[PDB]
A paper describes a structure:
Ubiquitin-specific protease 47 (USP47), a member of the USP family of deubiquitinating enzymes (DUBs), is involved in diverse cellular processes. USP47 is widely involved in tumor development, metastasis, and other processes while performing a more regulatory role in inflammatory responses, myocardial infarction, and neuronal development. The crystal structures of the catalytic domain, in its free and ubiquitin-bound states, reveal that the misaligned catalytic triads, ultimately, become aligned upon ubiquitin-binding, similar to USP7, thereby becoming ready for catalysis. Our study provides molecular details of USP47 regulation, substrate recognition, and the hotspots for drug discovery by targeting USP47.
We obtained crystals for cUSP47CD and determined the crystal structure at 2.6 Å resolution. The three molecules in an asymmetric unit have pairwise RMSD ≤ 0.65 Å for 316 Cα atoms. It revealed a canonical USP fold with three distinct subdomains: Thumb, Fingers, and Palm. The Fingers comprised four β strands in the center (β1, β2, β4, and β7), an α−helix (α7), and an additional two β strands (β5 and β6) at the tip that harbors four cysteine residues, which coordinates the structural Zn. In the apo form, the Sγ of the catalytic Cys97 was 10.0 Å from Nδ1 of His420 (insert), although the Nε2 of His420 made a hydrogen bond with Asn437 Oδ1. Therefore, the catalytic triads were incompetent for catalysis. In the free form, the His178 imidazole ring and the Trp169 indole ring form a π–π interaction, which hovers over a cluster of hydrophobic residues, e.g., Tyr98, Leu99, Ile139, Leu163, Phe167, Tyr175, Leu183, Leu186, and Met187 from α1, α5, and SL. The SL takes up a helical segment and puts the Tyr175 sidechain into the hydrophobic cluster. This couples with the rotation of the Tyr98 and the catalytic Cys97 away from the canonical active configuration. Arg309 in USP47 deserves special attention since it appears to stabilize BL1 conformation in the apo state, i.e., the guanidinium group of Arg309 stabilizes the switching loop by making H-bonds to His178, Asp179, Tyr175, and Tyr421 in all three molecules.
Author numbering:
A (entry chain A), B (entry chain A): 76 to 118, 133 to 328, 382 to 492
Write the structure that this text describes.
Amino acid sequence: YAIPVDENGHRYVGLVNQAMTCYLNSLVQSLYMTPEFRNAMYDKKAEQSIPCQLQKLFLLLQTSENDSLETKDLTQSFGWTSNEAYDQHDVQELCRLMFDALEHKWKGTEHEKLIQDLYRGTMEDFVACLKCGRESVKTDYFLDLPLAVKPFGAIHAYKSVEEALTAFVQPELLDGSNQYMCENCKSKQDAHKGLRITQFPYLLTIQLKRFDFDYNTMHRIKLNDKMTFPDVLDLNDYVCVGQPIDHAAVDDIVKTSGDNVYELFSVMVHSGNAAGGHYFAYIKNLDQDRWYVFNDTRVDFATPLEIEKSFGGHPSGWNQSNTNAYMLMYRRIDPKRNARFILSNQLPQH
Amino acid sequence: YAIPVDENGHRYVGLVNQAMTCYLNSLVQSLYMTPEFRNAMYDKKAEQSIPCQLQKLFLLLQTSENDSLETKDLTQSFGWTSNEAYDQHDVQELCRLMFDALEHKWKGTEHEKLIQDLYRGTMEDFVACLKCGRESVKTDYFLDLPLAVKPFGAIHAYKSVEEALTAFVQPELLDGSNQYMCENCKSKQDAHKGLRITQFPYLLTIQLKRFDFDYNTMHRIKLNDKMTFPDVLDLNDYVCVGQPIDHAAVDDIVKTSGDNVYELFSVMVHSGNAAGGHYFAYIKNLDQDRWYVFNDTRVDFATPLEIEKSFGGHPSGWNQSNTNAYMLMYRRIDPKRNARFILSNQLPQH
Ligand SMILES: [Zn+2]
Ligand SMILES: [Zn+2]
């Protein structure tokens, strides 16, 4: 008989219908439900600024009592006036456009390193000669973890996010026909080439490569292979029901067995055909550890079965009603860094 | 002491410098050196029409005695006025834009089926239940053969185009966690899902997926793994030095062992960094069986070693001067269908 309310005791507010906006609503809500992000969003006409429109929409989403909110001014601030704008852009491009604008405005403030302190991880890609042992390494940064679901030529698709991440750090063996020209050996030798992660982001974004673009269609296509992912992700080695409520204790056990533990709080999913389909997301309020389904004008309680179905699985054919997740958002579990949503009664003005 | 001349005894004409046009010149020349395509290109102000600009450029490339030609009117007919237009588009998108315009103009003529008669192959993607044996198939068309070089998580990259094509038709096994919901079995069962080719195009285009787009850069990246490809490609099973002159006899031997034999005539390659680099192509005149390097304002004789280097291979590091091929163009060997370049003295007017 209850209703979804915010930490403030205020009803959750939805967004307008996804009139070809695709991932837009799911992305906005997922960012609005990030504590550090929303907390940082507070402190001629510059109405075209992405930060100001995002700040107006966040304040409305937190204080307004309506059911749905408009996103016409936000997509105007992006400059994406075309009707097919979101069909021709990946969600990662929109995340980069918003983060670039926020970084450009926050330059010189106490939030100029905020975006990279939250979302940036560091890895290094190397080439290790197997004869002499010398390496050539270069350090890379990343804001996403781009994991494939079913690689080209694969006989089995990855059954879990962990399995895809393991293959993501798998060293490629450079032998036979494509050996490596070693400078120390001054000749072609067998070698290892690949990635290795040195620091995961504080806010971990995982892209599940279900969406591909067929150029012969030329429309979007989507893999429906089943891939699992937990609420508590243990990534210590890189340096099945998780939908219900988290263990406060097992997380401490994993902390005693490594420091890189992550808590799932956003599951952005898609249904129907890939040439469009219906986008929405399952987002968890981290302060109250409660899951909710954010679907356009309707924010409702989410059940563990509803979220668990987003693991995917091949249906009967091209019927073809099926919902699976394409993006995941985790937050590192640090009882010292982890911030809570500041309450609405702490806002200075309106 | 000789000079590259056309079948007409006329010197080959180059194009202007690739001022951020990337694959444009290599694509134009490869289409201009296709016999059926160039032969079909002959028979308010509609200057914005893609076909008319392509026809003007082809006639100039065939009759003009200059060294280089301008491509400003062609890129204007595309509508790609932006300086970063070719950086933000794949070459397959440009091929589709040109073919769509040609098909739209050729509608109702004797060339309305020309584009699909030359470049379109047919395949079918299926789901075969391993218990009951029933299949659900749907027929697909394709203008490209998108072959990966190094798939996600792969330990070894494909050493040849044939190996990547074999993995391209490799059936995925749907068992364990992602079984297939069979409608005849009314339950989840193990199954096979994948592609199988029923008819290769008369003009076979092969895309080598060396170019990927890193969203964390966010620039283009390129794999440098060595992958071979022959001049005589035997694709019978799907229904190392090939750079020198073709066997007229071995091709007949392969014809006695299957009908789908293809002759390589275009090798579009790229050098340097992927964030840009230098684009050019090795194209063969099929009438005279002679290889030439088309590099901007310079068309020269191509040696077998120059073309064989385009197989790739990992250099010493990120130095990183290295040239490898991203696209291949084959023509089916049919002494009845295979057309020759009609001579310039057969043109009606100028
Ligand atoms: Zn070495
Ligand atoms: Zn069955």
